[PDB]
Symmetry: D2
Subunit: 398 residues, 4 copies
């Protein structure tokens, strides 16, 4: 029965914020409102909480009670005014963009983006009259120059794959402020616990709660956090009309549960990541590592200004090419070969031989897809087991 008072700690808010059992029969854990619609005592009441002149419910695709908790709790974590829960990370971004953008508008994106966010942009909204421009969100000079009066939205992820490149959120925020552009940042990798873009200036944050937020890989979910005005626009339009990405109260309840241990889990993802990154840094097979924890990381100072810890994500270039990458991934025994991250279990991936095994060294390299770059999502397993696993894979990657 806290979170919402003066200023309870992060971990106290990710557990209590927004809920007092005294308001729900005393149920310690909040009841799950797994219902599609709600009823009214009078046609007059219905009308009231239909026109917004009243606080109530009537249909879950619009707003649900258990969903309103996750949302309220998530907003408090990112330090925003309000949040909206959705069916998936793509439901969050597509819902945001579909209502913020219109034909003739221009949107500036980071030089790199999450595959489906790229496809959506260049083959989805991008083919419905909206303008796209990929700029270096770390290059403020270039950002300012790329700005036009048609610029409505600035969208990027920080950090961004594959080299965990970082952006200057507070600087971008400033430019967009002068020009009147809305800043949207994908904060799946850090979570509200490791980085809070809204405080650095960004206007809205989108998450793929499917990853770190759920932390157990058993639900697909997305989240949006920003001003009431903005989230309200996105709730009444993007999600309801243009997208139907409605989140199941059950999954929302599952999300809210995985969040009750967000700080602990993140603490552990980073810890295992730090020692693994440094262990990777002494092997002659690894010729380059992309991890914010190492001081040799190009944007070390910028990373440590925005991020609380270097995150539990690392990537490196195996000296040996695509063949070594294949051998390295085929030899892994604890690290699972799959796509995704933020799971308790350790995941690893070699895009050059997996998601891009079709292309050519010439084309894959064109997309900035290194030939021997493998990426791992360090889980909550015992480092010893982890170090041992990649240790043998390396001996096999040769």
């Amino acid at each position: 029965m806290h979170g919402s008072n003066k200023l309870p700690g992060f971990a106290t808010r990710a557990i209590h914020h927004g809920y007092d059992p005294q308001d729900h029969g005393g149920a310690l854990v909040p009841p799950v409102y797994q219902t599609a619609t709600f009823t009214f005592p009078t046609v007059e009441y219905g009308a009231a909480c239909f026109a917004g002149e009243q606080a109530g419910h009537f249909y879950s695709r619009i707003s649900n009670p258990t969903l309103n908790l996750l949302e309220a709790r998530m907003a408090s974590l990112e330090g925003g005014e309000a949040g909206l829960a959705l069916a998936s990370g793509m439901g969050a971004i597509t819902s945001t963009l579909w209502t913020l953008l219109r034909p003739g508008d221009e949107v500036l994106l980071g030089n790199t983006l999450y595959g489906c966010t790229f496809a959506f942009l260049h083959h989805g909204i991008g083919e419905f009259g909206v303008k796209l421009r990929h700029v270096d969100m770390a290059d403020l000079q270039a950002l300012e120059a790329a700005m036009t009066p048609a610029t409505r939205v600035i969208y990027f992820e920080s950090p961004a794959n594959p080299n965990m490149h970082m952006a200057d959120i507070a600087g971008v925020a400033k430019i967009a402020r002068k020009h009147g552009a809305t800043v949207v940042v994908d904060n799946t990798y850090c979570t509200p616990y490791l980085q809070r873009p809204l405080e650095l200036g960004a206007d809205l944050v989108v998450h793929s709660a499917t990853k770190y937020l759920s932390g157990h890989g058993d639900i697909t979910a997305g989240i949006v956090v920003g001003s009431q005005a903005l989230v309200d626009r996105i709730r009444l339009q993007g999600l309801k009309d243009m997208t139907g990405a409605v989140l199941s109260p059950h999954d929302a309840a599952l999300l809210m549960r995985g969040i009750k241990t967000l700080n602990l889990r993140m603490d552990r993802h980073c810890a295992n990541a730090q020692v693994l990154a440094e262990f990777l840094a002494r092997q002659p097979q690894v010729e380059l590592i992309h991890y914010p924890g190492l001081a040799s990381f190009p944007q070390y100072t910028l990373a440590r200004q925005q991020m609380s810890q270097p995150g539990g994500m690392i990537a490196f270039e195996l000296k040996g090419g695509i063949g070594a990458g294949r051998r390295f991934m085929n030899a892994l025994q604890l690290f699972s070969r799959a796509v995704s991250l933020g799971d308790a279990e350790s995941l690893a991936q070699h895009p050059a031989s997996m998601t891009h095994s079709s292309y050519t060294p010439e084309e894959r390299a064109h997309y900035g897809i290194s030939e021997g770059l493998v990426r791992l999502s360090v889980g909550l397993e015992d480092i010893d087991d982890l170090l041992a696993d990649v240790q043998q894979a390396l001996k096999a990657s040769a």
Copy 2:
């Protein structure tokens, strides 16, 4: 374990189709794959699993096993090639159209659509360059007229609101074929058990499984059934990139549980509605009555040519206007005042005083929504009980 499709009876396929317990450890009820990621044995299996070389999964937003069973089964019930499961009715509607339509194309709409479907059409894709035109899909003379070399898809619901107005599905299917347009019908009200648009000529059918299909109002879900080529494209583009309206295995399984009693539940709905319609008709308080089961139904004959049964939705207009309606609704004890339909629970709504209450007799007239229009979604309760509520509520309407 018999669902040979087309051959085994409906009820038989609604329970077994697509599943043999022998293939899943003898599990009578299929295991729910509440997972987000799927891992590979090697990076070469992942590659083939990405280059369409190998059959398998890797991420539940693209495709999930539990959803695949739900999908295959729905397909069988509609006599369709392939199905697609989504987070809600609007996830299917928007996911379908977002991929079939582009800027410059035109789409012919049925006079009346679902509130949100109208909003998405007119304030969604519409504001992105797609041309819209409403045409009485029952008038084939006008349809043929309205056709153009640019009309890409014909979209409508049958029956439709606010009077259960039907369309000539095979009629427009023939026209759409000559010109080369895609007919997609919203078969929500009927369910594949009362009508199979695909067999009448339609190309795609979208469903709001939130209603009759789930039948118990505890989940929100949508469904798209059509040709393998059409559905594959909608999966790989509409859902994957532009909507992300992913359905949660937990809900998809609840839906498959509801479907298992589709026929039984739809029979009671139709049986109960008929009796109420009969009654409402002879009522002095009733000015007009819209129930496809009455021999006076304008389109009685057409209805029985497309619908195996009259469905369980009924609409009627009170002579006293908004006043009567407000009093009628407020006096209801067994019927619930709310939106939606298709629950074991009987739902009743009065637009002029609820959803469209913020209006005035202005458009309420322009939209065909009489001040006395009342829509009833007859549940499965005891008809004796439902009649006393309507009867009692009728007397209070005075």
Copy 3:
């Protein structure tokens, strides 16, 4: 919403009994209180609760809200004052007996009992000083004869395997009524829909809701209904201290869900049974058939005065004994080979070759089980599909 008071019809009460959305934020379907503990606003309240002075909760093992509804509902349907939900049918049986019996007490039992109920009495509570005596409850002169001052309770099922042998509930209650014994009936096969033993005189009724109540075979649950006085003891003694067979509210919800279509499902189970039982009757390969629906049924008159419908379970004997039954069973394609009943899916089982393959012709025989007796739990599939599966199988049983 219509409560009980026994006025609203069975179908109304089995859907709305004891629930008013208005009292729960207007949620059509009750929110599921999936929580282990409930908090107190003050220490006083918590106390007043523990002292019954105040009504509320504290621990979901003694009393949970979600389960409470289910319990108020099942009592209504059964026509008793109180109900109680447990982890399983056995958890209900054992909990009831574990609290009504003590060393020296005597239990008069029906001749044939469900496997685990038998093993429970003879190898469970039986090895703790409780005397067990099997009697033919259809014979009142025999029962009254076995009646002794130490007889504390009378337990039986009606109908009971292997040939749905019936009992005279009202007559038994009379004998028990005069001596002071407690009558408890396992009403699993009939459900409150087809038979209400409480209305005939029984003191307590038990159910394996893992069957017809759920009707969808995805949960195992138990139910007990009877007076407030008796049930309270079972909850606060049998459930709480012994067995501790607590039901998950998730499962309780799934159960109230399947119950919403109880009458519809039972109506079909029986219609399919009658036809199937009449088709087997005309078969020369079948020697004897046990179905309360056939006019030849031995207790056909007693059956029709206690049950509103013959039910959905069938047992019959093949002329070719063992081998005919094995070949038949091993040939079935739509019916499944499995224990259990009350599922939407049709199940079949041949003791002589499955559960009792262990025994010998003599053993089984001298144990009640013929060599060619097979039991079918007719499902909701299409009758012609079911009939053609038994037909094909009968021919393969040559």
Copy 4:
């Protein structure tokens, strides 16, 4: 690694043991087998199963595949041979005691036992011919002086409320292997991460997974781990026949989720309670503190021997008695007033005013309840937030 092959650490087994996705369609999170019955391909196979000659399932009450992994995992965590899941903690102890005891047998019990298990023993099995006697399990001489040829089981909690009194598990275990008797340790409080009785000589461990194991108070479950032999006996007798406390695969899947973060949460719980215990040790209002972490704790050494960490429970007495206990309790703002423990939410309780508020000081003392003893279950919230709550409450107690 990826289980318990390459002698994986605890955190690694807590999330990987017993499961390899490459065996279940590559699913990262194992599919939930929410099914009651399992079918067979031939009657023969079914016979095999029923007998035990063929590996498989046929009914979940006996054994379910999702529960098998929960069981197998726990077995690894506790370092045991086999495990079993039950509907609840009580379901675990009763199911266990009901199968290892018969009239004429004697069971030696620790001096203090959990409220319900005491009632169970003294008003359940106890009234069924079983002889029970309490002996201080920290006093090996008295324990041995109590061993009789009739002694069959030694059952104790360690630590045990209300003062966290310990017992020499290796000690009583050695006395047992000598005088027969089976050792059953209720290891709920410490979990297999903080204490492993099996590795000290215990025969079985019962768990109220409803607490720390679950971790989030949304489940009620129990766990038993020990030798295949003893465990196989409890499965096929206590579970199956005398208890029926079946676990829902839903909750068993949920519980396996919480276990995925056991080490992490357990660490915070302990690090949190220490600080809190230290702080309580310096306040004028506190008369006595029972925390195994305080160097002043009577069994400090022995605790340090068996428990890897001091745990998360803290009991203490207020010089002010009940009055001081009520005001301090009623004054709590972050801690919640409720029974139970092991949740991410901090809970507190004062027996003298809640559960025993009705008894007189005499009665209370004649049971083991102090007039000013309050028990605190320290959650995972923020320590600074927790200190502040207790601080003001302590002040409110004047």
